Design a protein that fits this description.
It is classed as isomerase(intramolecular oxidoreductase). This protein has about 240 residues and is α/β, with parallel strands linked by helices. The protein has a single domain, classed as TIM Barrel, CATH 3.20.20.70. Helix content is about 40%, strand content about 15%. It has an eight-stranded parallel barrel with strand order 1-2-3-4-5-6-7-8, surrounded by five helices. It is globular and about 45 Å long.
């Protein structure tokens, strides 16, 4: 069956939100995550209190970086986000290096991966995707898998208002999951969370969650809205 769902907020007034969250009742087992920017990290660190919520940093690579975050008491990290890869020019190899560094340092990690409008049109989604992951996996250990979460988000669906169809997410999630099953393990694979990210809103969410291989979400825009709750609520 499904592993624990995950609803993660990617924070690209906030306190009015944490207030909401904080006063919200989450009945089921789901792990909530609010990734924030270094600036709001302290805010969020104090204000956020819902026992079902954690905070995660963003592309905080470095040895010392890692250490302080931890020390600061930050245990989750978002790595390989399109922003990173695009504006910062991080390569799969680079992404992987960071992921492996996070993991060795105890972080829980959300490694992001996903294909462009172009790569998609050309029908190169599996190549691309398998490739991204095979870069990370190569640096991991079967054991390390216990700390990694994969976020699948088609670049063209990020903030464009263009969600994948439940079939596209499913299909992709499925291949991700199959490659892991085969290459890593079946046991690694079946315990693995593969989130969908890319234009998720409290409206489309349920339909997305329902797919066999979707384990949650990674939400930018609607995670700045009160509907983030409707979002978390769908992971049930």
């Amino acid at each position: 069956s499904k592993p624990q769902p995950i609803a993660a907020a990617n924070w690209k007034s906030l306190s009015e939100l944490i207030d909401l969250f904080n006063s919200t009742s989450i009945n089921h087992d789901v792990q909530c995550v609010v990734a924030s920017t270094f600036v709001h990290l302290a805010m969020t660190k104090e204000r956020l209190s819902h026992p079902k919520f954690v905070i995660a940093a963003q592309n905080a690579g470095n040895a010392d970086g890692l250490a302080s975050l931890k020390d600061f008491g930050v245990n989750w990290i978002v790595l390989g986000h399109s922003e990173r890869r695009w504006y910062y020019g991080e390569t799969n190899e680079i992404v992987a290096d960071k992921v492996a560094a996070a993991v060795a340092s105890g972080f829980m990690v959300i490694a992001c991966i996903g294909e462009t409008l172009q790569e998609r049109e050309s029908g190169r989604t599996a190549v691309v995707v398998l490739t991204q992951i095979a870069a990370i996996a190569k640096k991991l250990k079967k054991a390390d898998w216990a700390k990694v979460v994969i976020a699948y988000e088609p670049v063209w669906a990020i903030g464009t208002g263009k969600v994948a169809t439940p079939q596209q997410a499913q299909e992709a999630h499925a291949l991700i999951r199959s490659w892991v099953s085969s290459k890593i393990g079946a046991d690694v694979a079946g315990e693995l969370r593969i989130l969908y990210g890319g234009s998720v809103n409290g409206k489309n969410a349920r339909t997305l969650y329902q797919q066999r291989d979707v384990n949650g979400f990674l939400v930018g825009g609607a995670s700045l809205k009160p509907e983030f709750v409707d979002i978390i609520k769908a992971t049930q």
